[PDB]
Scaffold this motif. Structure first.
Motif, short mmCIF file in Angstrom:
data_model
loop_
_atom_site.label_atom_id
_atom_site.label_comp_id
_atom_site.label_asym_id
_atom_site.label_seq_id
_atom_site.Cartn_x
_atom_site.Cartn_y
_atom_site.Cartn_z
N UNK A 257 -24.72 7.92 -3.54
CA UNK A 257 -23.59 7.62 -1.63
C UNK A 257 -22.37 9.28 -1.53
N UNK A 258 -22.37 8.95 -0.45
CA UNK A 258 -21.68 10.39 -0.16
C UNK A 258 -19.86 9.92 -0.20
N UNK A 259 -19.00 10.33 -0.25
CA UNK A 259 -17.68 10.78 -0.05
C UNK A 259 -16.85 10.54 1.12
N UNK A 260 -16.29 8.78 1.07
CA UNK A 260 -15.30 8.17 2.32
C UNK A 260 -14.57 9.26 1.99
N UNK A 261 -13.57 8.96 3.01
CA UNK A 261 -12.35 9.51 3.90
C UNK A 261 -11.25 8.46 3.99
N UNK B 256 -14.24 2.30 -1.82
CA UNK B 256 -14.44 2.67 -2.37
C UNK B 256 -15.57 2.34 -4.17
N UNK B 257 -16.05 1.05 -3.22
CA UNK B 257 -16.47 0.22 -4.61
C UNK B 257 -17.95 0.57 -4.78
N UNK B 258 -17.73 1.15 -6.59
CA UNK B 258 -18.93 1.82 -6.38
C UNK B 258 -20.12 1.71 -5.91
N UNK B 259 -21.22 2.03 -5.88
CA UNK B 259 -21.21 3.67 -6.62
C UNK B 259 -19.78 4.62 -5.81
N UNK C 89 -7.90 2.82 -6.54
CA UNK C 89 -7.17 2.06 -7.42
C UNK C 89 -7.19 0.67 -7.16
N UNK C 90 -7.35 -0.34 -7.82
CA UNK C 90 -7.49 -1.74 -7.80
C UNK C 90 -8.21 -2.27 -6.31
N UNK C 91 -7.41 -1.48 -5.32
CA UNK C 91 -7.93 -2.11 -4.10
C UNK C 91 -9.21 -1.46 -3.72
N UNK C 92 -10.46 -1.06 -4.53
CA UNK C 92 -10.85 -0.25 -4.95
C UNK C 92 -10.97 0.85 -3.13
N UNK C 93 -10.20 1.39 -3.24
CA UNK C 93 -9.45 2.50 -1.45
C UNK C 93 -9.34 3.60 -1.74
#
Length: 36
Positions: free
Chosen positions: A2-6, A11-14, A24-28
């Motif tokens: 998957x592409x890279x977010x901004x 950030x939820x893998x993958x 971080x823990x906030x998957x962001x």
């Protein structure tokens, strides 16, 4: 793959967050010098 977010994005893998932003823990996306 998957592409890279901004900044301030899921950030939820993958999923990943383009640097220097880090996940971080906030998957962001949050800069390492943000204060988290």
């Amino acid at each position: 793959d998957f592409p890279l977010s901004k900044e301030y994005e899921s950030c939820v893998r993958p999923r990943k967050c383009k640097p220097p932003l880090k996940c971080n823990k906030a998957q962001i996306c949050v800069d390492p010098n943000k204060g988290w």
